[PDB]
Amino acid sequence: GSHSMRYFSTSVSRPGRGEPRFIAVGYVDDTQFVRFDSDAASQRMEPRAPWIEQEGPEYWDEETGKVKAHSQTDRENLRIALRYYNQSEAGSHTLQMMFGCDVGSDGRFLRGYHQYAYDGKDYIALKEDLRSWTAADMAAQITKRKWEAAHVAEQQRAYLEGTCVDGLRRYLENGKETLQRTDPPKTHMTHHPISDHEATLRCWALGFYPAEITLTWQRDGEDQTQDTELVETRPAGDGTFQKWAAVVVPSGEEQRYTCHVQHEGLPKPLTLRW
């Protein structure tokens, strides 16, 4: 199937307590592989996946340089965003950044990304055509005019269709063993009475990768939102993922209910019944 590479960076200001905390991480698909933390001692881009340790010193030196500089840029943007928004120097703000590309099965470029959020809200983003920007509001509009002047979009477009996708394909190769594995969910059902008239049915998916999965309940061959609970997909910690879904069900009507599991590691979609 497809793949993605993502970099995420977060800056949180803390006035009185010194410099913004900065943390960057990078993923290939759902597997994390680098991190940088402004508050840690190394002050280095650090490896977080086995198949990235094999990069030469020149690689670690440059990635550190880029990400240190980026933290100063977002340090700067924090100050600027205070001014654009006319906010006091007393409080605390977050600036988040996201950058990356998706490729297809052939390894060819599918899509590029580059966006910002301030205080958890959309700020500016590169549109799908990687030619123009979307600015959430009046403040981001100023930045939008700037980046249009500076031809930022065209730089970033060339990076995304080039370097991004080349690094991505190179990483997918370096970690073949691991990143192209496709673990199907192992499934089972559990059952608990809640009263004399009702019971809970819980439908479990375990040990799958990648995280993308769909669990859906049917009554008598029809979807059901009503009386369902569905938790966020969660990491097991060993590199696999977990999820479940549950319905509260009248007693002795268990057999009408079915849980449908979908996942790309699965030849046919699965159906569980109690």
Partner: peptide, 10 residues
Amino acid sequence: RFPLTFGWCF
């Protein structure tokens, strides 16, 4: 490889 973000001034 982390992006090149020098001209990402607000």
